[PDB]
Amino acid sequence: LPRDTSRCVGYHGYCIRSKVCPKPFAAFGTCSWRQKTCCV
């Protein structure tokens, strides 16, 4: 996996290509590289 993807999925949620996460989710830093945002 990219770099931080495994970090966020180690929690509970998913990674999206967007800087606005659908609710209920929070923008947890960055997922794959700096392209995807972590939604947990």
CSV table of N, CA, C and O in Angstrom, one decimal:
chain,number,residue,atom,x,y,z
A,1,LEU,N,0.8,-1.2,0.0
A,1,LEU,CA,0.0,0.0,0.0
A,1,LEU,C,0.9,1.2,0.0
A,1,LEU,O,2.0,1.2,0.5
A,2,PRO,N,0.4,2.3,-0.6
A,2,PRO,CA,1.0,3.7,-0.7
A,2,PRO,C,1.9,4.0,0.5
A,2,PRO,O,3.2,3.8,0.4
A,3,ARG,N,1.4,4.5,1.6
A,3,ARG,CA,2.2,5.0,2.7
A,3,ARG,C,1.4,5.1,4.0
A,3,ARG,O,1.7,4.5,5.0
A,4,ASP,N,0.3,5.9,3.9
A,4,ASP,CA,-0.5,6.2,5.1
A,4,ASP,C,-1.9,5.5,5.0
A,4,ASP,O,-2.7,5.5,5.9
A,5,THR,N,-2.1,4.8,3.9
A,5,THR,CA,-3.4,4.1,3.6
A,5,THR,C,-3.6,3.0,4.7
A,5,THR,O,-4.7,3.0,5.4
A,6,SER,N,-2.6,2.2,5.0
A,6,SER,CA,-2.6,1.2,6.0
A,6,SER,C,-2.8,1.7,7.4
A,6,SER,O,-3.4,1.1,8.3
A,7,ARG,N,-2.4,3.0,7.6
A,7,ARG,CA,-2.5,3.6,8.8
A,7,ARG,C,-4.0,3.9,9.2
A,7,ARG,O,-4.4,3.6,10.2
A,8,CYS,N,-4.7,4.5,8.2
A,8,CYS,CA,-6.1,4.9,8.4
A,8,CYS,C,-7.0,3.7,8.4
A,8,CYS,O,-8.0,3.6,9.2
A,9,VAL,N,-6.7,2.7,7.5
A,9,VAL,CA,-7.6,1.5,7.5
A,9,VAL,C,-7.3,0.6,8.7
A,9,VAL,O,-8.1,-0.3,9.0
A,10,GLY,N,-6.2,0.9,9.4
A,10,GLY,CA,-5.9,0.3,10.7
A,10,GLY,C,-6.9,0.7,11.7
A,10,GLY,O,-7.1,0.1,12.8
A,11,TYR,N,-7.6,1.8,11.4
A,11,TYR,CA,-8.7,2.3,12.2
A,11,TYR,C,-10.0,1.7,11.8
A,11,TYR,O,-10.2,0.5,11.8
A,12,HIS,N,-10.9,2.6,11.3
A,12,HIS,CA,-12.2,2.1,10.8
A,12,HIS,C,-12.8,3.1,9.8
A,12,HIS,O,-13.2,4.2,10.2
A,13,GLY,N,-12.8,2.8,8.5
A,13,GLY,CA,-13.3,3.7,7.5
A,13,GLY,C,-12.8,3.3,6.2
A,13,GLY,O,-12.7,2.2,5.8
A,14,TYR,N,-12.4,4.3,5.4
A,14,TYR,CA,-11.9,4.1,4.1
A,14,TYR,C,-11.2,5.4,3.5
A,14,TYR,O,-11.3,6.5,4.1
A,15,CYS,N,-10.6,5.2,2.3
A,15,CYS,CA,-9.9,6.3,1.7
A,15,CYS,C,-10.6,6.8,0.4
A,15,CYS,O,-11.0,5.9,-0.4
A,16,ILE,N,-10.7,8.1,0.3
A,16,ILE,CA,-11.4,8.6,-0.9
A,16,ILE,C,-10.5,9.6,-1.6
A,16,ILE,O,-9.6,10.2,-1.0
A,17,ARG,N,-10.7,9.8,-2.9
A,17,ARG,CA,-10.1,10.9,-3.6
A,17,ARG,C,-11.0,12.2,-3.5
A,17,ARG,O,-11.7,12.5,-4.4
A,18,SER,N,-10.8,12.9,-2.5
A,18,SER,CA,-11.5,14.1,-2.2
A,18,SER,C,-11.0,14.7,-0.8
A,18,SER,O,-10.6,13.9,0.0
A,19,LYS,N,-11.1,16.0,-0.6
A,19,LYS,CA,-10.7,16.6,0.6
A,19,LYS,C,-11.9,16.8,1.5
A,19,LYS,O,-11.7,17.4,2.6
A,20,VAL,N,-13.0,16.4,1.1
A,20,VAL,CA,-14.2,16.5,1.9
A,20,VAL,C,-14.9,15.1,2.1
A,20,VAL,O,-15.4,14.5,1.2
A,21,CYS,N,-14.7,14.6,3.3
A,21,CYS,CA,-15.2,13.2,3.6
A,21,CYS,C,-16.7,13.3,3.9
A,21,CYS,O,-17.3,14.2,4.6
A,22,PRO,N,-17.4,12.3,3.3
A,22,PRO,CA,-18.9,12.1,3.6
A,22,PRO,C,-19.2,11.8,5.0
A,22,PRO,O,-18.4,11.1,5.7
A,23,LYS,N,-20.3,12.2,5.5
A,23,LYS,CA,-20.6,12.0,6.9
A,23,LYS,C,-21.4,10.7,7.1
A,23,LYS,O,-22.1,10.3,6.2
A,24,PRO,N,-21.2,10.1,8.3
A,24,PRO,CA,-20.3,10.6,9.3
A,24,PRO,C,-18.9,10.1,9.2
A,24,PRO,O,-18.7,8.9,9.5
A,25,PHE,N,-18.0,10.9,8.9
A,25,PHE,CA,-16.5,10.6,8.8
A,25,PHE,C,-15.7,11.9,9.0
A,25,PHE,O,-16.2,13.0,8.8
A,26,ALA,N,-14.5,11.7,9.4
A,26,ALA,CA,-13.6,12.8,9.6
A,26,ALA,C,-12.4,12.7,8.7
A,26,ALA,O,-11.9,11.6,8.4
A,27,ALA,N,-11.9,13.9,8.3
A,27,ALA,CA,-10.7,13.9,7.5
A,27,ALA,C,-9.5,13.6,8.3
A,27,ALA,O,-8.8,14.5,8.8
A,28,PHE,N,-9.1,12.3,8.3
A,28,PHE,CA,-8.0,11.8,9.1
A,28,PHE,C,-6.7,12.0,8.2
A,28,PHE,O,-6.4,11.1,7.5
A,29,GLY,N,-6.1,13.1,8.4
A,29,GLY,CA,-4.8,13.3,7.7
A,29,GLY,C,-4.8,13.1,6.2
A,29,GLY,O,-5.6,13.7,5.5
A,30,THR,N,-4.0,12.2,5.8
A,30,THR,CA,-3.9,11.8,4.4
A,30,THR,C,-3.7,10.3,4.2
A,30,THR,O,-3.0,9.7,4.9
A,31,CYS,N,-4.4,9.8,3.2
A,31,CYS,CA,-4.3,8.4,2.7
A,31,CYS,C,-3.3,8.4,1.6
A,31,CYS,O,-2.5,9.3,1.5
A,32,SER,N,-3.3,7.3,0.8
A,32,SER,CA,-2.4,7.1,-0.2
A,32,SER,C,-1.7,8.4,-0.7
A,32,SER,O,-2.3,9.2,-1.4
A,33,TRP,N,-0.4,8.5,-0.4
A,33,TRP,CA,0.4,9.6,-0.7
A,33,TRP,C,-0.1,10.9,-0.1
A,33,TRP,O,-0.3,11.0,1.1
A,34,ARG,N,-0.5,11.9,-1.0
A,34,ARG,CA,-1.2,13.1,-0.5
A,34,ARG,C,-2.4,13.3,-1.4
A,34,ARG,O,-2.8,14.5,-1.5
A,35,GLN,N,-2.9,12.3,-2.0
A,35,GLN,CA,-3.9,12.4,-3.0
A,35,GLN,C,-5.3,12.1,-2.4
A,35,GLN,O,-6.3,12.7,-2.7
A,36,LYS,N,-5.3,11.1,-1.5
A,36,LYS,CA,-6.5,10.6,-1.0
A,36,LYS,C,-6.6,11.0,0.5
A,36,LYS,O,-5.6,11.1,1.2
A,37,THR,N,-7.8,11.4,1.0
A,37,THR,CA,-8.0,11.7,2.4
A,37,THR,C,-8.6,10.5,3.1
A,37,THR,O,-9.3,9.7,2.5
A,38,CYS,N,-8.2,10.3,4.4
A,38,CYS,CA,-8.7,9.2,5.1
A,38,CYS,C,-10.0,9.6,5.8
A,38,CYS,O,-10.1,10.6,6.5
A,39,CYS,N,-11.0,8.7,5.6
A,39,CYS,CA,-12.3,9.0,6.2
A,39,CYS,C,-12.6,7.9,7.2
A,39,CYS,O,-12.8,6.8,6.9
A,40,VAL,N,-12.6,8.4,8.5
A,40,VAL,CA,-12.9,7.5,9.6
A,40,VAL,C,-13.7,8.2,10.6
A,40,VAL,O,-13.5,9.4,10.8
